[model samples]
Target: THLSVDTKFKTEGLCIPKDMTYRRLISMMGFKMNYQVNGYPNMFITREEAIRHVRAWIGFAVANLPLQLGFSTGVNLVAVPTKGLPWNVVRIKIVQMLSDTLKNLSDRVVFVLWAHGFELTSMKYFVKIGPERTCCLCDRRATCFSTASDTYACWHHSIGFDYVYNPFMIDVQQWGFTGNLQSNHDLYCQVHGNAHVASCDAIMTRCLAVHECFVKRVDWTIEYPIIGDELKINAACRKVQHMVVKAALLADKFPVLHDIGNPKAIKCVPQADVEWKFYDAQPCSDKAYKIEELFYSYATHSDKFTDGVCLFWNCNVDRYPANSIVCRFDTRVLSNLNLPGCDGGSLYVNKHAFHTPAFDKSAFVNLKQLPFFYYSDSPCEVPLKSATCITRCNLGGAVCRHHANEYRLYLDAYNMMISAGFSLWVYKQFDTYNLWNTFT
Candidate 1:
């Protein structure tokens, strides 16, 4: 499961069951069991090719070299020269080695030859990153760390596809889950659950000493001369010491260095101003509709409410693209009325579903049919997801501003693509509306 790399990332289609085997999980992650990065022999990557392949992944990041897995980069790249071992055997050995590696605390720059004999590699690839688990590395970058290392040892934070719009830290603001090395029992579980979280969170880093990689800034490149070498362990057996000290210079490990840090070097420069930026020109339909208008226009005023509208974030893809469609509300007692910030925004609807009941022209009832929920001043900041209690808790009494519960209007919609589901994130900034009307 950890050995498969999923190139594309999305939110839905991720309802994976907990009992899936490595083979099942790999397939679920978009990799066929027999698929390999290189054809013919899937696991036939040479040590040098892999070392280079791994170096590119590690070298490109603005990184931190922490004490061994840390509050920083979390990746471990091993050059496993399986020689004659089969792919399945390599998988087992990798899993076995990873589990064994985590059983004790380790320092950075350690060799694993004796540990696994032949199916061995480096922990340098498992680069711990960020304050709390973040999508800052994204799916490709994050999953690269796991599968590239040949084990799913670090997926607790890797499966964050919805992380683009909302992060684990941001979500737990509602749940109060915080701290880097706080405690294993405190790992938060909003979606995937706890057992998955605790193990992934603590599998590395128990000694308080963490090996890390800092994101490389233009002015900073770590430099540490060789302090010790080989036959090599007993040639006095060390100088992870110099590497550690090099990291110390890069961090607050030395008290004086921490106090007198390089603040004077920080400044704004012209070349740094980013002269000409190149971005693909994006376009969308000139017109869009409000949720309330659709509610009435289709459900009562017209008969086509049976067919729902699909919302497209792109103006028009190179060709017309698929959409995240909005359908009818499942609840009847209340619509999004009386909720704070329920002012209409971009929402989709499946009018055909409403061809049944839940339709009425009464001002209050129709107002109750309003599916508009909360949105930020910046429309994209508010992600699309369903909410409960009619989009808000109406409490015992009336007070629009004081209502409780989430304001996410769960206007039902299915995000589908006639073409393969390549998407522009909310940040790509194309907001176009397409209505489904011919289904009358």
Candidate 2:
């Protein structure tokens, strides 16, 4: 027959089942009721300290009882030794009693064991329990003790120990499982699955998030600004936002910053150019330029070639204008004008100054072009007028043939005039010559 009690114990009321033996209950909750027999030294510095640890353990469970009870599908019961308590007889006894107490209160609530200890004592306990039998968290057997967290866990759940002291936390919910355990077990299994890769430094972000949740209850500085006063809390809030943004940026991903409900609170600079520039410095096999067809078209206008000068009147036009003027300077116009009258009178030819891609001269005639007036020759001009020769030729005026000295005089007068016009045009088009070097 089941025993029913009217008075409330640690929980509201107890209705203990007739077959609920202490040993049976302990086994069901995943603990050995006779741990002391196994030579596990579960003692404490002082008896009072031992009692306090036990009380605190039970209190923590009770506090979380509502949540566990409500979410019958999933919950986690986690505990560590109280500040003054160590791994001793008291700790083992505390686990036994706590399991028994919880069992009496609710039949459905499950109890799981996790072993956490300081560095020096972990190896001692690991030897006593043995790897195959010892499990620090969940049902799997312990593999080795982690000197970092000072905890012993199964092969799958051992990652927690490696990073416990680090700012990043182990995601514990994914630890382990038995066959068809339930939602709570599912969480543990998921957390445990990541253990193999979790120890790798590549998973630092995941560790940090997990650590934040673990110590969220009491204010401890895993992440700084410490959530204490309003100033610190607000600062912490900003730090969290910054960390999130920084992570996304580092990953080469962008996060949404638009109206995420709180305009004042959720602020972030998702992508910073300085940070991107720094990242781009790393050597990689990515080309920064591309190739395409090299078909350059030419435009020309007769109005721009007035006053016997090939005037690029608007050479500094950086953009397309409403009333557009287009002109293409043809070097061959002066080059091919070595007529009978001007044959051996050498023109101002400076081959060193001009350069262009080599092409077969036989296949192309008068093959030179530049949109500036720096190199031009008017072979048949008399002083400033090329029109004089055209008029004299048509009306039979018999204009006298000029020598090499006459050619230089006429070229000097026209060249000086062109230079003055070019200077005036450039000055009107630009306020300053800061970018003038780009022309050369």
Candidate 3:
């Protein structure tokens, strides 16, 4: 039901009730409400003067003992109501009062009016005002909520992960779902197969290529330098030294792949090559240093534990390559050799303690002579109770079996000597003799 609207006063601001509905308010002012292309609602007119003919009480209400009302100057008002109202008579009363009130105010004062209602009516009004929630995977309105990220979800995505622990698990025939879950599930499986296939091909090619490269680049012919010193004279020591070098060269020949995607591997080649062998050293008999029993201890240790500081010599010019490589030498070797214990003591102590075996110059000097073919300046040099003579060798290299960055030449040369079994005793000595001597 339309009424003759009042336009006598200058209604600069259009005020509508915050809770008013669009349907009744548009028709009450003799205007039509239509939706725009973007799936939203709006009001439009053919003529400009038709706008001034329209005025709305910004805040309208019902069952009011007295309506709360007011207005302002110099601003044109527009109505954008998202819901509906109770009755036509209530809107009529609201518009009439606002029209009459605006007349008395100055040019700057535009009066607006709002009605009040009982608690029961307010509660009913709230129910009419629905929430416009939308789904996560699509533009369709959401029917439910999901805890994944506390988001509204459409009928399909609203469903949670299946009972199985793996989120990607799905039947191959699964299809015609409401949301994207099925598509995503199938994609995961396809990618998984692709990854496995690529991995197999890469490893097979990489191992073959690496093996071929080593064969061509390395000179496998074994040779020995003539020995004059007692250290080189020991056939066992020289043979052992040779073995260490060969092991080191083995490591140099093929380094593990760091970039799985790229076939190129091996960071650096050996600075120089030396012939070496893993000769059997029976300094003590098999009975004295029962290697079989020794293996059992570590095998038992391996069963109970997975990690510890076990010494390993890569025999590389730089021991840093295999700093943490686990040593699998039998327990009998350590016991029969009567070397310091590594299992129960601290790494720094067992592997590095200087005073345990009590520094014997004869043994230490012999350790230096063990590296027959290779030569390094010194691990360390200390006066043996007199100024005339002193002992020197790669002390740091001897101790850690790992090179020290601070001393470049020492690390490189000592590791070379390491490959040649420079010091049979110091091969695993792993200590800094010079540093300790300087302090002592």
Residue 21's C-alpha lDDT in candidate 3? 43
Per-residue lDDT of model 3, residues 1-440, tens digit only:
12112212111213235344434543444433343332223221111211121121111112233322111211111222232334333333323333333322111111112111221122221111124455568774543333345665433444441110100001111122222222332322222121222222222222222222221222122222222222322343334333433333333332321111111212222343432111111112323332211221222333421222222222211121212221112222222112221111110111111112112243222122222222223343221121212223333223222212323433344454343322333233333333235423
Task: Please give the lDDT score for candidate 1.
Answer: 0.21
Per-residue lDDT of 292-403 in model 1, one digit per residue for the tens?
2122222233332222222222212112112111122222222211000101111111110011222123312211111222221111112323332221223223324322
* Among all candidates shown, the one with the greatest lDDT: 3
lDDT, candidates in the order shown:
0.21, 0.24, 0.25
Q: Lowest lDDT 10-mer window, candidate 2? A: 338-347
What does the lDDT come to for candidate 2?
0.24
